[PDB]
Nucleic acid binder design. Structure first.
Lengths: 193, 193, 193, 193, 193
DNA sequence: CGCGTTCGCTCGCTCGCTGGCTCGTG
DNA sequence: CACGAGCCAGCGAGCGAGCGAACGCG
């Protein structure tokens, strides 16, 4: 069946405070990117911090891209951009197929190095553990959950906490940016158990 | 010989008054469960609050199940559902075999938490001490009685006070739901003493 | 709100009687450190055992530093160096934020070991429980108090019992080394309750 | 001031009648121990049951030893070995300093258990209440007297009722084994009141 | 002094029940091995399940051998093959000398993996916990007893419960397969304590 | 005395740490 | 290749609810 690893990445929303030394082309880029809610959505765009989302998106892209290089395939995934009490963080779920838990982290450290070079122009974000692999516990091994995790902990999130979502997993392509669709699946899930 | 611990559980009846926040699936469940008196019984089914019994049963089940997980065995028992002045409460008698009096609670309480998650969908019953271990007194030890306790204090009970009973203890499998069989053993007991 | 843990450290005053084997560089260090009362103070510097205070401070510094490594933040605190019938002892109050009662102990332990290697050049102080966490009672939970604990039990102290104080908590920055400012807050406290 | 607790222990003087099961090494030990009266004494060593005294001494040693483990200090004391109408019994007076009135029991109970293991080789003396804490009354609270209690009730005792005594309390170190010294202080006491 | 760890191993004495998939060469091996009681023995060989003992021995050998690889020495030991109500199980005691309680399990496991490959030709015995280490208590450290444990709990055993014994520990080389030598040391032990 | 309140001791559960493998990269 | 970062099962001090004798006032 489908099993996934979870890698949480914090979004360094502030230029100088998080990325001291970054050029302007960066600050202009994050700005010169306007987000638009697709037809089937129903989210309040006013509650979607666009500047951050623009960064989180790039992150996600490079991540998945660089990841598929290892998995040697089109890894089914489900990214959810969240905004919490501390800071923004991308909840990413990729399918294990192709990456043995014994070597996941040797690869994430390859992607992390890449995010920096591409997204942040070789600048190390001054954020503590901005790319952490979800373990079963401290010193435990890579967690690994099944599809069920999405509607169980990810879907129930609602703005402003919820910001955006992505996913090539058909079963949730609509639940991505639609609080209604979600509420449905989220209910269904709590039922069949 | 056979020794038993006694754990009294108050069975909640008013979904709102006792379990505020509970969904509907629960209220529908307790309802969609009809009780029928087995052939050898002789009780007035009209005096058996089925809605509560439905809950008391589930409690009983999960309690025993979770309990055998500790006793590492098929613990002999005898549960009696009673209805009193204050509220309904399951008189449970499990054999000590395997549970030291010093660590009774830690396990008992491990169960309580379970009942909540399973039976009441993570909702803490607003009832004072709905799961109390019977103490020989104040600051006393966990009271532990022998088989004789059943016919001595449990069997004598008659409707409406008595609502139902369970037991894998052959010696009383018929006295469970039969006021006649009970009156017999109850008398016998009073005799051989 | 702000909640704090309390870690009492007995400061080993007598070099040879408490730290047998310690070099001279240590004894010289504690001596070559002259303390001076800040302008806003009003303490009798004559009653402030500088040699011990020099050590208590080092202790304090390392403690806090190492502590923030755990809390992953600038933990609000309030340390008060006291001198009693038995021996000097730093009353430390750090905010719980970050350290779950369960693990508090394995954290202070690492610190303790750190204090030895850094402050006492790996020499184990021959003092009974020189670093002890406050419990709400033998076998009880790690006592966690709120800001109020400070003016309630710490501020009322006056020389010679009081020796010094530290704190990044603005509300008491002046009460630290000012018996007058103290008496003020100490009074206000006893009133508003 | 100096306050004391009183624990009366019944020294098992009949190897078989009181300690059934004890080995021989014990009976040989008590025998191979000859008592001698120190220079300042004046007691008739002929009236001093050596065999019992040998056990009473061991008892007293272990008692005080184990006790100091609790009081965390050198507890001032005054043990008097007496011989009554029923049996020999050590009158022990230790200073409360360190042992609250709500826990004296649990601490003595531990000592008792220790005396058995060390002194009597895990053999429970068949003597009713051989280790009783002196109370104010039956059902009362743990009694506690001051230094005055020694010359008031303990010193007056004279052979054969008086067998021996001990005490790290200077004021009575001579009155211990000297009927003369005692009679003096005993006199002085009755006067200054 | 001599301290030992205790590793209990069951004995998968069933080709079709415990080792499904095993070849015949194995079943023929355990059979083509006839045990004989040494001269100094006195055991009833009729009560010695030879087929199991043949496996238990191989287990023991590989174990010890592999173990000395870690200990970097000739580890003093004492293995006792026992037959219980559930199944056969080798009581093994190896001297800690060289294996820090921290890596015990990590090593034993390497041994377990070796037993499988060598003794059972890569077939995982379908027995629950067939190679368990004994700990003081849950959450406690690995149990480490001294020489005395042998006569204290191991020697008393008598057929059919006792099946055999090994040991390079001179002091018990004879008590190994002699119920008489055992009874002596077993007695002596109970005395000198 | 009976009976309710202390409060030292018990002992399963938690969760960061140890330290021998594993396996891709330079 | 060997390293050496990432891995993680095994570990066990620390914890804190519970338990129950000891106690001692009404």
């Amino acid at each position: 069946m489908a099993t996934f690893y979870e890698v949480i990445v914090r979004v360094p929303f502030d230029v100088e405070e998080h990325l001291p030394g970054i050029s302007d082309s960066f600050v202009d880029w994050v700005t010169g990117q306007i987000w638009e809610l697709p037809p089937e959505s129903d989210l309040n765009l006013t509650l979607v911090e666009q500047p951050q989302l623009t960064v989180a998106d790039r992150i996600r892209r490079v991540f998945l891209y660089e990841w598929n290089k290892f998995s040697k395939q089109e890894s089914k995934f489900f990214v959810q951009f969240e905004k919490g009490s501390e800071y923004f963080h991308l909840h990413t779920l990729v399918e294990t197929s192709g990456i043995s838990s014994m070597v996941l982290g040797r690869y994430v450290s390859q992607i992390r190095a890449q995010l920096v070079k591409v997204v942040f122009q070789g600048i190390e974000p001054q954020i503590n553990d901005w790319v952490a692999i979800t373990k079963v516990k401290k010193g435990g091994a890579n967690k690994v959950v099944d599809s069920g995790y999405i509607p169980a902990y990810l879907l129930p999130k609602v703005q402003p906490e919820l910001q955006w979502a992505w996913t090539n997993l058909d079963e949730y392509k609509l639940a991505a940016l639609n609080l209604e669709e979600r509420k449905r699946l989220v209910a269904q899930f709590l039922a069949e158990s």
